[PDB]
Structures are given as C-alpha cells and as structure tokens.
Amino acid sequence: EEQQMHLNVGLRKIKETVDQVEELRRKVNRSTALLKSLSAERERWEKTSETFKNQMSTIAGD
Structure with a gap:
C-alpha cells in the first residue's frame, strides 16, 4: 500500500x-523535452499503477 x-x-x-x-511556457526545445518526458513518465507510472493492482490479487495465496 505504501509503495x-x-x-x-x-x-x-x-x-x-x-x-x-x-507557466514557464506562457527555451522552446527544453519545453519540448519536458513534454516528451511528461508523456514517457505518465505512461510508465500509469502502467506501473495498473500492475500494482495485480499484486494485490495474487498476494493471499503467495
């Protein structure tokens, strides 16, 4: 749970x-790098969170 x-x-x-x-947007290349890091981190952490609910399913028998 804490994880x-x-x-x-x-x-x-x-x-x-x-x-x-x-807020800073309102350099350009740095902003684009931040948005691509945004997308990558969102995808990775969303899939990690989705995986986390799987461990709770298979914890009692283990």
Whole structure:
C-alpha cells in the first residue's frame, strides 16, 4: 500500500512540474523535452499503477 502511495505522491509531483513548465511556457526545445518526458513518465507510472493492482490479487495465496 505504501509503495502505491509513493507512486501517487510522485504522480502529483509530476503534475506540479507540468503546471510549472506550462507557466514557464506562457527555451522552446527544453519545453519540448519536458513534454516528451511528461508523456514517457505518465505512461510508465500509469502502467506501473495498473500492475500494482495485480499484486494485490495474487498476494493471499503467495
């Protein structure tokens, strides 16, 4: 549970970073790098969170 809480806190922190980068946008290449890191991190952490619900399923028998 705490390992998923850490992931949720990290996701919220990444949202804060997204807000900061968007505020800064309002260099261009650095912003594009931040958006691509945004996409990569969102995908990886979303799939990690999806996987986390699988371990809770297979924890009792293990």
